[PDB]
């Protein structure tokens, strides 16, 4: 529909939420009076007004709205009849009148049960309509609810099998403890903000520091008063707009309390960084915050929070180890079994309306806040986007004040209770604040629409994997946190990665400070990280400030709260993991790595006991913090009389190093590719990156002979690690220069390499690595060319490439040329497709591990799990990979693309799709037999 219509409809719905039925009715009447405005008006808007009048009990007003719809010439739909019935139920209308309305429903050819099923309504509304029917002669005759559907796909068939071989893991914490944790999370959700003491050591305040704190407090109070005044003036103007009939944001402002809006704007000023944040981004954030605090308020007033409490305690019983449930069920399945109490307000406001509201809030903040060196926030264009910059004096005042209180959004902090089961894409993660399956802002609406179009069962398999990831419990390690605290307080170490005290150094310090503060806050408290999916389908943790993927130090800090005994092989797995973290003997086999671990055991023990004053071998290792944490675990295990008896909280990371290349070589079944990426079983693992480096070296020597001097500049500086980063950029990308920037960063890290030609060197490395990868792998070269040419052809048609993963979740590329960008779509599709396959293999592995009872989480390529679980999870990854590639993914992709776009350039696309790469000699089953496929 029209953009104006979208906002008018949003205004009416918001008025229903605010209970401003007269204002909405008045605006509707004004629009009806003008013929052009009446054309803008839609039946759904009238239905919404009727619903609100049917929640008030004013039948006469509802009838007047019906008269207006008749004057417009629209015909009353099922929703209008629904509202009439519910109003009659509320007001105890005479049975004969209800019967007359029912006759009019049959006059429009509409069954009452069918109309109720077709049009969604609040349960109070449904109860009212049902009572109306019960007053009338007709019986309610409610149809029984259908049992929840399950996936028929062969890959997920084993997961959904009804045979009672399932042994789902149960959380160690008792049920009562889980309920208390839920209560803490609930209180946090109601407040919507978390105050955390600053990690940085607080010096005794000086006289000047105290004065700065007083000045800041006075300024904050002055800003609060100004903000309240500005909000009131804007509300009055918007109410006048409501009388005029122009679209107004007055209900949107009304939904959140005036004090809450002011408190939110003030916290936004405190949260905003010294460099500043984009004005458009800030406006979007403000609108999202308002919607969140309003959904929480609406649930509280409705009573949806109490019903949720009860329903959730029942769900908690399944998770709790002490409580026993006779039939094991998947968490979403169990939730659905208890019922569906999800709020109907989970759906958000239209994006243009949200943008308008956010911009209004940002403008109010800028005008209201003034401080003497005038306004705190300065709007300056940059790319070429307006940004809001904090006052320089304000930043200095903040530094001088050194306030220990840090505010964080409820969404920003990890949950204190298990995440809500993902029964639907829209409703997941935080119980009170709805989390949308698509974490990524870009392409979220299109992807969400695709998800709704996709059958629920296919969504269900991914939803189960996400729920399982959320259910995993994370506890911060005390020892690592303490060491990081000591270094962070006093300068820190660049090699360790602790940021130096506060161009980007200040930002890094602030981000680290927030992450450490969250870690300290949750150090003694078990917490659950919800997982959200991007467009590619990769799973990411929802909280931005604290997540394992974000930083190496965070990876060291985070360890499983649930504890599983090492077992006979657990100690060996810990040693192998430690060697992997160091990066020593990567090419050598696992047996050699274990022998090396025995050789370096003395260093391991010394480093664990005294990290700061020890040999500091862990610092030498490529991942210092992770190495130190592993060293501590190994030391504890040896100290314990039995290593098998000892329980290792710390995760053991198993990775294929090049998951995308492994998928490319499996798809083409290339023998050379399988050997290079370790798909083929071998006594000694062969490093793909080393082979790429060799091929790069031969190309480098050819270029040195040639006039181009880039090779000479890079001669002797193409280290294996840098090559590894370049290979990852080529295989995995969103067609962005940022990955190339990472290659540049690796080149910058080498002091000997000149930075004068670093940009050219990064470009040249990308080209050389791409040539090397294609040359070494015939199957990969073919598949990549086919994908690139298919994506390019689809982009020319003008439709964004859309494909369905083997799991069944549809993946779309969110690139929009200001139309799809041909460059991004053609280059993006091979990496995005490879990512989707990797995520599919990860979800299959996770679900099967869940059936086995292993705790599984995925961080990038690495698959995290307990040391005892590692061997089993390796077997699962080897079987699931084979099963995924057993299905003809290339053929399925070609057929799906043919359906999506060929039946519309399409013929050329059809020919390209038809010419799928032929299967290679290498046997798929070999992957199962390959011990070194993941290591």
JSON list of N, CA and C in Angstrom, two decimals, residues 15-25 48-62 83 86-92 125 128:
[
{"chain": "A", "resi": 15, "resn": "UNK", "atom": "N", "xyz": [-2.97, 4.36, 18.68]},
{"chain": "A", "resi": 15, "resn": "UNK", "atom": "CA", "xyz": [-4.04, 4.97, 19.46]},
{"chain": "A", "resi": 15, "resn": "UNK", "atom": "C", "xyz": [-4.81, 3.91, 20.22]},
{"chain": "A", "resi": 16, "resn": "UNK", "atom": "N", "xyz": [-5.02, 2.75, 19.59]},
{"chain": "A", "resi": 16, "resn": "UNK", "atom": "CA", "xyz": [-5.68, 1.67, 20.31]},
{"chain": "A", "resi": 16, "resn": "UNK", "atom": "C", "xyz": [-4.85, 1.27, 21.52]},
{"chain": "A", "resi": 17, "resn": "UNK", "atom": "N", "xyz": [-3.53, 1.20, 21.35]},
{"chain": "A", "resi": 17, "resn": "UNK", "atom": "CA", "xyz": [-2.66, 0.85, 22.47]},
{"chain": "A", "resi": 17, "resn": "UNK", "atom": "C", "xyz": [-2.73, 1.90, 23.57]},
{"chain": "A", "resi": 18, "resn": "UNK", "atom": "N", "xyz": [-2.76, 3.19, 23.20]},
{"chain": "A", "resi": 18, "resn": "UNK", "atom": "CA", "xyz": [-2.81, 4.25, 24.20]},
{"chain": "A", "resi": 18, "resn": "UNK", "atom": "C", "xyz": [-4.20, 4.44, 24.79]},
{"chain": "A", "resi": 19, "resn": "UNK", "atom": "N", "xyz": [-5.21, 3.79, 24.21]},
{"chain": "A", "resi": 19, "resn": "UNK", "atom": "CA", "xyz": [-6.61, 3.90, 24.63]},
{"chain": "A", "resi": 19, "resn": "UNK", "atom": "C", "xyz": [-7.20, 5.23, 24.22]},
{"chain": "A", "resi": 20, "resn": "UNK", "atom": "N", "xyz": [-6.53, 5.93, 23.29]},
{"chain": "A", "resi": 20, "resn": "UNK", "atom": "CA", "xyz": [-7.03, 7.19, 22.75]},
{"chain": "A", "resi": 20, "resn": "UNK", "atom": "C", "xyz": [-8.00, 6.92, 21.60]},
{"chain": "A", "resi": 21, "resn": "UNK", "atom": "N", "xyz": [-9.10, 6.25, 21.94]},
{"chain": "A", "resi": 21, "resn": "UNK", "atom": "CA", "xyz": [-10.11, 5.97, 20.93]},
{"chain": "A", "resi": 21, "resn": "UNK", "atom": "C", "xyz": [-10.76, 7.23, 20.38]},
{"chain": "A", "resi": 22, "resn": "UNK", "atom": "N", "xyz": [-11.12, 8.24, 21.18]},
{"chain": "A", "resi": 22, "resn": "UNK", "atom": "CA", "xyz": [-11.70, 9.45, 20.57]},
{"chain": "A", "resi": 22, "resn": "UNK", "atom": "C", "xyz": [-10.76, 10.14, 19.59]},
{"chain": "A", "resi": 23, "resn": "UNK", "atom": "N", "xyz": [-9.47, 10.23, 19.91]},
{"chain": "A", "resi": 23, "resn": "UNK", "atom": "CA", "xyz": [-8.54, 10.90, 19.00]},
{"chain": "A", "resi": 23, "resn": "UNK", "atom": "C", "xyz": [-8.44, 10.15, 17.67]},
{"chain": "A", "resi": 24, "resn": "UNK", "atom": "N", "xyz": [-8.33, 8.82, 17.73]},
{"chain": "A", "resi": 24, "resn": "UNK", "atom": "CA", "xyz": [-8.26, 8.03, 16.51]},
{"chain": "A", "resi": 24, "resn": "UNK", "atom": "C", "xyz": [-9.55, 8.16, 15.72]},
{"chain": "A", "resi": 25, "resn": "UNK", "atom": "N", "xyz": [-10.69, 8.12, 16.41]},
{"chain": "A", "resi": 25, "resn": "UNK", "atom": "CA", "xyz": [-11.97, 8.24, 15.72]},
{"chain": "A", "resi": 25, "resn": "UNK", "atom": "C", "xyz": [-12.08, 9.60, 15.05]},
{"chain": "A", "resi": 48, "resn": "UNK", "atom": "N", "xyz": [-9.53, -1.60, 12.76]},
{"chain": "A", "resi": 48, "resn": "UNK", "atom": "CA", "xyz": [-8.78, -1.34, 13.98]},
{"chain": "A", "resi": 48, "resn": "UNK", "atom": "C", "xyz": [-9.55, -0.40, 14.89]},
{"chain": "A", "resi": 49, "resn": "UNK", "atom": "N", "xyz": [-10.15, 0.65, 14.31]},
{"chain": "A", "resi": 49, "resn": "UNK", "atom": "CA", "xyz": [-10.94, 1.57, 15.11]},
{"chain": "A", "resi": 49, "resn": "UNK", "atom": "C", "xyz": [-12.12, 0.83, 15.73]},
{"chain": "A", "resi": 50, "resn": "UNK", "atom": "N", "xyz": [-12.75, -0.05, 14.95]},
{"chain": "A", "resi": 50, "resn": "UNK", "atom": "CA", "xyz": [-13.87, -0.83, 15.47]},
{"chain": "A", "resi": 50, "resn": "UNK", "atom": "C", "xyz": [-13.42, -1.70, 16.63]},
{"chain": "A", "resi": 51, "resn": "UNK", "atom": "N", "xyz": [-12.26, -2.33, 16.49]},
{"chain": "A", "resi": 51, "resn": "UNK", "atom": "CA", "xyz": [-11.74, -3.20, 17.55]},
{"chain": "A", "resi": 51, "resn": "UNK", "atom": "C", "xyz": [-11.57, -2.41, 18.83]},
{"chain": "A", "resi": 52, "resn": "UNK", "atom": "N", "xyz": [-10.97, -1.22, 18.72]},
{"chain": "A", "resi": 52, "resn": "UNK", "atom": "CA", "xyz": [-10.78, -0.40, 19.91]},
{"chain": "A", "resi": 52, "resn": "UNK", "atom": "C", "xyz": [-12.10, -0.01, 20.54]},
{"chain": "A", "resi": 53, "resn": "UNK", "atom": "N", "xyz": [-13.07, 0.37, 19.71]},
{"chain": "A", "resi": 53, "resn": "UNK", "atom": "CA", "xyz": [-14.40, 0.68, 20.23]},
{"chain": "A", "resi": 53, "resn": "UNK", "atom": "C", "xyz": [-15.04, -0.54, 20.87]},
{"chain": "A", "resi": 54, "resn": "UNK", "atom": "N", "xyz": [-14.65, -1.73, 20.41]},
{"chain": "A", "resi": 54, "resn": "UNK", "atom": "CA", "xyz": [-15.19, -2.99, 20.91]},
{"chain": "A", "resi": 54, "resn": "UNK", "atom": "C", "xyz": [-14.41, -3.48, 22.11]},
{"chain": "A", "resi": 55, "resn": "UNK", "atom": "N", "xyz": [-13.42, -2.70, 22.54]},
{"chain": "A", "resi": 55, "resn": "UNK", "atom": "CA", "xyz": [-12.67, -2.97, 23.76]},
{"chain": "A", "resi": 55, "resn": "UNK", "atom": "C", "xyz": [-13.09, -1.98, 24.83]},
{"chain": "A", "resi": 56, "resn": "UNK", "atom": "N", "xyz": [-13.74, -0.90, 24.41]},
{"chain": "A", "resi": 56, "resn": "UNK", "atom": "CA", "xyz": [-14.36, 0.12, 25.24]},
{"chain": "A", "resi": 56, "resn": "UNK", "atom": "C", "xyz": [-15.79, -0.26, 25.61]},
{"chain": "A", "resi": 57, "resn": "UNK", "atom": "N", "xyz": [-16.49, -0.93, 24.69]},
{"chain": "A", "resi": 57, "resn": "UNK", "atom": "CA", "xyz": [-17.88, -1.28, 24.88]},
{"chain": "A", "resi": 57, "resn": "UNK", "atom": "C", "xyz": [-18.87, -0.29, 24.32]},
{"chain": "A", "resi": 58, "resn": "UNK", "atom": "N", "xyz": [-18.41, 0.71, 23.56]},
{"chain": "A", "resi": 58, "resn": "UNK", "atom": "CA", "xyz": [-19.30, 1.68, 22.93]},
{"chain": "A", "resi": 58, "resn": "UNK", "atom": "C", "xyz": [-19.78, 1.14, 21.58]},
{"chain": "A", "resi": 59, "resn": "UNK", "atom": "N", "xyz": [-20.92, 0.45, 21.60]},
{"chain": "A", "resi": 59, "resn": "UNK", "atom": "CA", "xyz": [-21.46, -0.12, 20.38]},
{"chain": "A", "resi": 59, "resn": "UNK", "atom": "C", "xyz": [-21.86, 0.97, 19.39]},
{"chain": "A", "resi": 60, "resn": "UNK", "atom": "N", "xyz": [-22.41, 2.08, 19.90]},
{"chain": "A", "resi": 60, "resn": "UNK", "atom": "CA", "xyz": [-22.89, 3.14, 19.03]},
{"chain": "A", "resi": 60, "resn": "UNK", "atom": "C", "xyz": [-21.76, 3.71, 18.19]},
{"chain": "A", "resi": 61, "resn": "UNK", "atom": "N", "xyz": [-20.59, 3.92, 18.80]},
{"chain": "A", "resi": 61, "resn": "UNK", "atom": "CA", "xyz": [-19.44, 4.40, 18.05]},
{"chain": "A", "resi": 61, "resn": "UNK", "atom": "C", "xyz": [-19.02, 3.37, 17.00]},
{"chain": "A", "resi": 62, "resn": "UNK", "atom": "N", "xyz": [-19.03, 2.09, 17.36]},
{"chain": "A", "resi": 62, "resn": "UNK", "atom": "CA", "xyz": [-18.67, 1.05, 16.40]},
{"chain": "A", "resi": 62, "resn": "UNK", "atom": "C", "xyz": [-19.64, 1.07, 15.23]},
{"chain": "A", "resi": 83, "resn": "UNK", "atom": "N", "xyz": [-15.45, -7.70, 15.66]},
{"chain": "A", "resi": 83, "resn": "UNK", "atom": "CA", "xyz": [-15.53, -6.59, 16.61]},
{"chain": "A", "resi": 83, "resn": "UNK", "atom": "C", "xyz": [-16.96, -6.39, 17.10]},
{"chain": "A", "resi": 86, "resn": "UNK", "atom": "N", "xyz": [-17.59, -9.19, 19.64]},
{"chain": "A", "resi": 86, "resn": "UNK", "atom": "CA", "xyz": [-16.86, -9.01, 20.90]},
{"chain": "A", "resi": 86, "resn": "UNK", "atom": "C", "xyz": [-17.47, -7.85, 21.70]},
{"chain": "A", "resi": 87, "resn": "UNK", "atom": "N", "xyz": [-17.88, -6.78, 21.01]},
{"chain": "A", "resi": 87, "resn": "UNK", "atom": "CA", "xyz": [-18.53, -5.68, 21.70]},
{"chain": "A", "resi": 87, "resn": "UNK", "atom": "C", "xyz": [-19.82, -6.15, 22.35]},
{"chain": "A", "resi": 88, "resn": "UNK", "atom": "N", "xyz": [-20.59, -6.97, 21.62]},
{"chain": "A", "resi": 88, "resn": "UNK", "atom": "CA", "xyz": [-21.83, -7.50, 22.19]},
{"chain": "A", "resi": 88, "resn": "UNK", "atom": "C", "xyz": [-21.54, -8.36, 23.41]},
{"chain": "A", "resi": 89, "resn": "UNK", "atom": "N", "xyz": [-20.47, -9.16, 23.34]},
{"chain": "A", "resi": 89, "resn": "UNK", "atom": "CA", "xyz": [-20.07, -9.96, 24.49]},
{"chain": "A", "resi": 89, "resn": "UNK", "atom": "C", "xyz": [-19.69, -9.11, 25.68]},
{"chain": "A", "resi": 90, "resn": "UNK", "atom": "N", "xyz": [-19.01, -7.98, 25.43]},
{"chain": "A", "resi": 90, "resn": "UNK", "atom": "CA", "xyz": [-18.60, -7.11, 26.52]},
{"chain": "A", "resi": 90, "resn": "UNK", "atom": "C", "xyz": [-19.81, -6.47, 27.19]},
{"chain": "A", "resi": 91, "resn": "UNK", "atom": "N", "xyz": [-20.82, -6.08, 26.41]},
{"chain": "A", "resi": 91, "resn": "UNK", "atom": "CA", "xyz": [-21.91, -5.26, 26.91]},
{"chain": "A", "resi": 91, "resn": "UNK", "atom": "C", "xyz": [-23.15, -6.09, 27.21]},
{"chain": "A", "resi": 92, "resn": "UNK", "atom": "N", "xyz": [-23.05, -7.42, 27.08]},
{"chain": "A", "resi": 92, "resn": "UNK", "atom": "CA", "xyz": [-24.16, -8.34, 27.34]},
{"chain": "A", "resi": 92, "resn": "UNK", "atom": "C", "xyz": [-25.38, -7.98, 26.49]},
{"chain": "A", "resi": 125, "resn": "UNK", "atom": "N", "xyz": [-10.63, -10.68, 23.40]},
{"chain": "A", "resi": 125, "resn": "UNK", "atom": "CA", "xyz": [-11.57, -10.38, 22.33]},
{"chain": "A", "resi": 125, "resn": "UNK", "atom": "C", "xyz": [-12.27, -11.66, 21.90]},
{"chain": "A", "resi": 128, "resn": "UNK", "atom": "N", "xyz": [-14.84, -12.70, 24.38]},
{"chain": "A", "resi": 128, "resn": "UNK", "atom": "CA", "xyz": [-16.05, -11.88, 24.27]},
{"chain": "A", "resi": 128, "resn": "UNK", "atom": "C", "xyz": [-16.90, -12.34, 23.09]}
]
